[PDB]
Design a protein around this ligand. Structure first.
Ligand SMILES: Nc1ncnc2c1ncn2[C@@H]1O[C@H](COP(=O)(O)OP(=O)(O)NP(=O)(O)O)[C@@H](O)[C@H]1O
Ligand SMILES: Nc1ncnc2c1ncn2[C@@H]1O[C@H](COP(=O)(O)OP(=O)(O)NP(=O)(O)O)[C@@H](O)[C@H]1O
Ligand SMILES: [K+]
Ligand SMILES: [K+]
Ligand SMILES: [Mg+2]
Ligand SMILES: [Mg+2]
Lengths: 612, 614
């Protein structure tokens, strides 16, 4: 049954009254003080941002008036005796009306009003941080009573006072002896007395607001001691600062091997810089020091992964003034602009690596040898076909049709290949000597088609997952053999019948091949790539057999000896085939742990040499 | 640069005034509707929670006076052409005064006053969700006009109207014929018309508000059809209830091989359930903690806290509590102190439970250990505290030489029968039982009357070196202890020994003799065998052997070694091949070969000439 009661019988007949939305202050203050910020160390960051905004406002006003610029700086005082923290700046300052309209009203900020009266919003709107208006009340989260002493920068403004305990009541009075600017006095709570020490304050200042645009003083000394090189032009920063900055963000002692200075403004504002370490990636390498900034203050998201996961081996910093933020000044989760930011960064980073090989191929070879693991991971974990192909341009392989010791790409491979050819062949082997001596490649010697050699691990899996490059099918050499379209015939036929009976449980069928010269036998299976992966995966973990085919080579010297061995030592003949069968399995790559074949090997040896 | 402008010259001189804090409603509404919630689909959950709170208030009012209990229902309606969504409720209802006090004021909730004026906080304080007072204002985030009809259930209340354009100004009127309860009419935004589709709303409801304590309906039919079993006592839930509950949570139609119903209050109020799938794990299980946190019967959607450790990701269930502090965005305060202690308590509770399951049923635990054995091994290598290592080591089932084939034993029961004054435990690695028994290393320690453990699973040699201790006992591998511990004619032996230094000097640095072997012609002993095995696979014979120090020991009583003497001078060419085969065989037996594909060629040409005389 459809238990529905919705109707449209509601009737409106009276005269509608008009009211205005109200607001309750005590609950809002409690919410801000208790259940808004996860950490308790953000109030100093908010105060520093406010001081920077005030200093910027004063500088802009003086520039507009064209007067003499005085000294402007921010001072932090840490007094551990009374258990108090004090911050003082030299900004514009606020009069009684401004104090009442700003410090006494929730969700009200004068910075937005000032920006609305700029008529350009480009000269100073890129440096104002405050946008909500509830950042000051984070002081009550660690304080019980607050004192504010402010005097405006106007020639004739008097000092004032601002007393409040954070309980919905505040008072204002006129003061004397107050200098130009503002001075915030904070009385620390009982459980929050850790913030009255210099070490913790210095740590938080260095973590959050290290790159403030104005001098910052704590008990006399200055903490910034560094420039934000991601906001400066590339023509104004030297090569020496590019290394010192890298050693700071990466927390290392080496030099970077690459340096990208990206700066774009058309799709969205990006001011970023990236580095690649000289040293080889370690085990721990398998936010990745890509900390996100906004108006030169740390955001500390570390979870949204603004950079792709496979690109976790690079360091640097990213700045953007258009990213949306929570009320707690934290990054929004999976915003529309955030997804677009990740795509833009990935496209530029891949393009940068392509030009590096085009400029200096020798340097790129060393980079690919060390960091090549990360590129293979990206293709496997990708979900869009165009993403896989774009990343695949960075792969390097060496082919049989070229001298040993040089690497080729999948792009130029499609250029020198014949127009009649349409698919790409690849053979996997531990080395190149084994690859050319591999029995699978020996059958391909008849055709002149060019093949690529894959040596490193996961190359076979990476090629299988890609499955297509530039509309060209990727097919392995092993799969193309089963699909491909001395020992007279009479004496040959009975020899297989003696193997089918013995190896019936292992060798499902045996057929005579004519394309082998060196290896006595081969093992062929349809899904060779999957078999070489599934078998290695099962021994890798007990998670959620097959039918192999063996082909003998009549022209082989050992196979010729099998005719005269059965009629003389039938016992020795059985062990010999059990050794040839496992030898073929090892060459194919379907070999299990080889500890079990030692017993059959030593026993065969001690009986096969008792003739000398 | 010690120059500080900080001083204390400033002081108060004039009279002090007095002022009251104010607020800006428009900016507050903009913040709530634009920069508060990450995802735009939370308004349905908020309004459903409000309806549930109203129904709870009505239920308390109707049970307090001891009167009959009418029907409580939630009705969701959708209209594609109109682009409107309707959620009608039959709760207490609100008159003009409650409407203007609660709806018309930001951060004002009547539930908190109702909760505090309860005087008992026993039956209703645990089922009230709203505590902030800004939940209703999330409707403006998706709607261009909000229209609400409501009337109280009091004997004499009348219907009313409520309109708001989202511009900070609302309006109230009087209405007749309004059904008792609350009815919310929402007109959707132009770009937010995707919420007028039945499938998307069904997804939102089945994601956020599955376990509401009242029957809810969507377009006529019921969407709940399932009760929350973790709230009741374990005696009130049956096996068939568990199967359906495990089916929904884990999306698996099989039977849960394990079931735990944790209920603790001394550290903090916890009401959680757990499950273990019967099927075998796959990559989707291994690939990334599959447990959804709950609080007062509503989804919280943590997705980042990971309340359970990484190695315990193979279990499924839900976790509920009422003492978790969540911020204004209805999400947990990240890295909170109270959150950290929940992870450790839950981990150790499950550690004890798995120990218990072994006692009452060893066969069931043994089958369970084989299926998920990677997860316990994974936790040991990823743990930092030594105390936790012992808690996990009790869950490992190994096999020793004191029992026949196919009887697994634990470390604790292994260490209860070992020697008196020596703190040593012996473990050996082999793919099978036959290989372990015939391993040359085991044959070397057969002299002593000591017990040795045979572990057959992979990555187990790495676990025993990371654990490093078990109740103050040193873990020593069989291969390592051989080095630590301190026929053929002599003349023919030493000259035979001297040849290998001449022909294997590049690959062998020292050759010795062992008399304790009688079934293997070769043996390789290394100082740190366990470390070499795991470090070799992650990272041709010359540079490999340089970092392994492959000491070679040859049994002189083996028949193969004896025949090498009479083949020394008859054909030196074949002798160069057989000695290499012995060297290669020893490495294969020792398991220190990265890939045996290179040794096939040398072996293949040996057989073609070994029996050519036949
Ligand atoms: N040190 C200061 N000097 C001058 N004005 C200040 C100072 N600190 C705060 N204000 C004023 O306080 C008002 C709002 O304070 P605040 O709480 O910081 O909001 P906001 O910083 O503008 N926005 P946000 O910090 O992002 O929440 C504005 O009018 C500021 O000009
Ligand atoms: N449908 C409703 N029926 C009855 N009372 C309601 C209804 N919706 C809202 N109210 C009342 O109006 C108040 C304001 O709504 P709301 O913003 O959800 O507050 P809250 O839910 O208690 N706290 P929060 O968790 O932020 O939603 C509620 O606390 C209720 O007292
Ligand atoms: K303010
Ligand atoms: K409200
Ligand atoms: Mg600010
Ligand atoms: Mg609510």
């Amino acid at each position: 049954p459809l238990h529905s009661i919705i109707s449209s019988t509601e009737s409106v007949q009276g005269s509608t009254s008009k009211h205005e939305f109200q607001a309750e202050t005590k609950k809002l203050l409690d919410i801000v003080a208790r259940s808004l910020y996860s950490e308790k160390e953000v109030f100093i960051r908010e105060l520093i941002s406010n001081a920077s905004d005030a200093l910027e406002k004063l500088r802009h006003k003086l520039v507009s008036d064209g007067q003499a610029l005085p000294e402007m700086e921010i001072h932090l005082q840490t007094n551990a005796e009374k258990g108090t923290i004090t911050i003082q700046d030299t900004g514009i300052g606020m009069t009684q009306e401004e104090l009442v309209s700003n410090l006494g009203t929730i969700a009200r900020s004068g910075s937005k009003a000032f920006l609305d009266a700029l008529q350009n919003q480009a000269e100073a709107s890129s440096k104002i941080i405050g946008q909500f208006g509830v950042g000051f009340y984070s002081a009550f989260m660690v304080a019980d009573r607050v004192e504010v002493y402010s005097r405006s920068a106007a020639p004739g403004s008097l000092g004032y006072q601002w007393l409040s305990d954070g309980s919905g009541v505040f008072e204002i009075a006129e003061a004397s002896g107050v200098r130009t600017g503002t001075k915030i006095i904070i009385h620390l709570k009982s459980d929050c007395k850790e913030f009255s020490s210099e070490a913790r304050v210095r740590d938080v200042v260095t973590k959050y607001s290290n790159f403030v645009s104005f001098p910052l003083y704590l008990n006399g000394r200055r903490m910034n001691t560094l420039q934000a090189i991601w906001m400066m032009d590339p023509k104004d920063v030297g090569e020496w600062q590019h290394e010192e900055f890298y050693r700071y963000v990466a927390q290392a002692h080496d030099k970077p091997r690459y340096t990208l200075h990206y700066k774009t403004d058309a799709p969205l504002n990006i001011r970023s810089i990236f580095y690649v370490p000289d040293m080889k990636p370690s085990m721990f390498d398998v936010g990745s020091s890509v900390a996100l900034y906004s108006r030169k203050v740390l955001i500390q998201t570390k979870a949204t992964d603004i950079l792709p996961k496979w690109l976790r081996f690079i360091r640097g910093v990213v700045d953007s003034e258009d990213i949306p933020l929570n009320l707690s000044r934290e990054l929004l989760q999976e915003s529309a602009l955030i997804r677009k930011l990740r795509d833009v960064l990935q496209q530029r980073l891949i393009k940068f690596f392509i030009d590096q090989s085009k400029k200096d191929a020798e340097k790129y070879a060393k980079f690919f040898e060390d960091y090549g693991l990360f590129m293979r991971e990206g293709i496997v974990t990708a979900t869009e076909q165009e993403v896989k192909e774009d990343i695949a341009k960075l792969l390097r392989y060496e082919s049989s049709a070229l001298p040993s010791g040089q690497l080729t790409s999948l792009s130029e491979y499609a250029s020198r290949m014949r127009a009649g050819t349409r698919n790409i062949y690849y053979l996997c082997a531990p080395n190149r000597h084994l690859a050319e001596h591999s029995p699978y490649y020996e059958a391909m010697k008849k055709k002149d088609t060019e093949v690529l050699f894959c040596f490193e691990q996961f190359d076979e899996l990476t090629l299988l997952h890609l499955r297509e490059f530039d509309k060209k099918k990727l097919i392995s050499v092993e799969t193309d053999i089963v699909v491909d379209h001395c020992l007279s015939e009479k004496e040959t036929e009975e020899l297989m019948a003696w193997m089918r009976n013995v190896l019936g449980s292992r060798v499902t069928n045996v057929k005579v091949t004519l394309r082998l010269d060196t290896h006595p036998a081969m093992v062929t299976v349809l899904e060779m790539g999957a078999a070489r992966h599934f078998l290695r995966m099962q021994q890798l973990a007990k998670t959620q057999l097959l039918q192999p085919t063996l082909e003998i080579n009549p022209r082989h010297a050992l196979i010729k000896k099998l005719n005269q061995l059965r009629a003389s030592e039938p016992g020795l003949a059985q062990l010999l085939v059990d050794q040839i069968y496992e030898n073929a399995m090892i060459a194919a790559g379907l070999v299990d742990d080889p500890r079990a074949m030692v017993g059959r090997l030593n026993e065969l040896l001690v009986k096969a040499l008792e003739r000398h």
